[PDB]
Amino acid sequence: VEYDVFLSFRGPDTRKQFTDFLYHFLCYYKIHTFRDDDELRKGKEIGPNLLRAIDQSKIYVPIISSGYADSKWCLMELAEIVRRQEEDPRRIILPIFYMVDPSDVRHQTGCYKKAFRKHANKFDGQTIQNWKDALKKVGDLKGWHIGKDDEQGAIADKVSADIWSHISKE
Amino acid sequence: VEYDVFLSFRGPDTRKQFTDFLYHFLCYYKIHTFRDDDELRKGKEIGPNLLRAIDQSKIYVPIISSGYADSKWCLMELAEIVRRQEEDPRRIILPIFYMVDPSDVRHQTGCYKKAFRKHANKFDGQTIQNWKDALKKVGDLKGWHIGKDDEQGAIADKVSADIWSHISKE
Amino acid sequence: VEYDVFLSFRGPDTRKQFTDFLYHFLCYYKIHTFRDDDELRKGKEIGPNLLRAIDQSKIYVPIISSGYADSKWCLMELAEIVRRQEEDPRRIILPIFYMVDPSDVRHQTGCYKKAFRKHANKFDGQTIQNWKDALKKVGDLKGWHIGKDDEQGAIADKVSADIWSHISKE
Amino acid sequence: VEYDVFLSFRGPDTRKQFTDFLYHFLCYYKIHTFRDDDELRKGKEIGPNLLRAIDQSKIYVPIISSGYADSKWCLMELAEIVRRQEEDPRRIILPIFYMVDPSDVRHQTGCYKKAFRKHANKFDGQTIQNWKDALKKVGDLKGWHIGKDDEQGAIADKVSADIWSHISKE
């Protein structure tokens, strides 16, 4: 009746490209999945929607993309995932890199440089250091890299069971 | 008194650069680690050495490199790792890609094509299909990708504790 | 609460290749280590950063590399290490040669010739003689040479305890 | 009245070139030094000569050369130095490499392969492994490398005081 898996991704990039199939494939294993498309903006952080499901989730599974560092709504939300995780280690994180190196995520260089080249003219000089401290630790856990040739279909089946193995056996 | 971790790597590539620290840093967490450098060749597969420790190990942790597909001994040995794993799933595998894409490992193309271009003129036409079937499934589990810029030191500490977390808590 | 060990190295050469693991292996012996990556350039010599920790350090441990004689910041900074050491001999220096002969360091010939020739068209004709006088005396103390085959891992454990032996026994 | 420093070297190589000065320069600092030239051979290991002074010495200071791995007496004698040192760590070892890399000493390869290619046809299959285990650990401590250009004179003065500093201050 509650949520056992909570996703997070980019807007226009992978909302129909691949994450959509995983939502439809996952529902075939009899588990309730949460994905959201509402652009929020109704304020700066909504409570009864995101904040509710965050504490209700069980396996936070982000999906870092190529342009995941531009939306001013994703990063600060990810800062709430990995922060809540460090307080109670009962839950886990299974990131999935996508079309990007597992090196442009630990130092925000490469395809993120100019993203933080303009993000530094608006916000505080400490809030940005809060993101780069949280975004870094995500790029150290285990994760299926998806190269240019790997099957966008076989990976889904392999990763889904790893989410279903931690539920049946508990 | 027995082995709880068994490694596997390339000869001249990463024997003295990155994998050597893994043996010296890991021994500081009070766990017995096995690494071997003897070129074997005394026959075709030694028993009391490799075959003994294989069944004695607890967490098989390979380290796929860039030229891991040339040494005849390594591949056919890896075919014995992932095969023994599929019979008893009590143990696990935590591969670590290295200076290579997580896409040139599922289809043996790219930097491996030259390798299997000459390996097909010696052995059977079925033994090769046995390797490509085993080498593929390794490139689907979780794994820390190490890009050109990631710190060769911080990764070690992060990956070591993940091997030490599955021992203390059991 | 203060620093007991202060490092110094080249930028792009050994910042992730080997010096990185030492910072992670050393922290496992419960001692606070200082390493810095900020390119400075904010002026010509920063005070509250480098100058503070220099006097706060206890065992200055440089790591001379192959291209350690090109960066305009490193040499003139090393001239401040060995100079402060000669006034109070309570502290020590444990250099570690790297991929270079212990002969190309006492006379600046070999792989340092062209770089020194270029540096002579900008600065004073006495400041350069100040470096060559300081860089020479460093290449006379004790030091673990690391050849092409020595294990990059076993050396770390051997050298770390020699830094930890001078702390526990005092 | 007893010996505070005990040397060890090759026969024809460095008996009259560099080590001879060390005996004459060192005696100018008012310390009693022991060097021996008798070829022994009167049996297999003499007692009242070598075995007496070994336990009487205070700072064992070998001088590894280029052909230090051929004489059947030197190695097995060095196996008695580093072995007695490991029981009481009150004393120390200050090796001095010479015209050789600090890499051909940790793995007995390069200029020593010919040496142990013929030494394995006479003695036991375990006594040889005893030497390679002792000769290795010597090549990990601190040591002044002497390259092709370093002054054979300035090094002596620098190394002598380091032996005299551990005597006056105690």
UniProtKB/TrEMBL annotation, chains A, B, C, D:
Parent-protein residues present: 59 to 228 of 1294
TIR domain boundaries: 1-167
Species per Swiss-Prot/TrEMBL record: Linum usitatissimum (Flax)
Name of the protein in question: Flax rust resistance protein
Gene: L
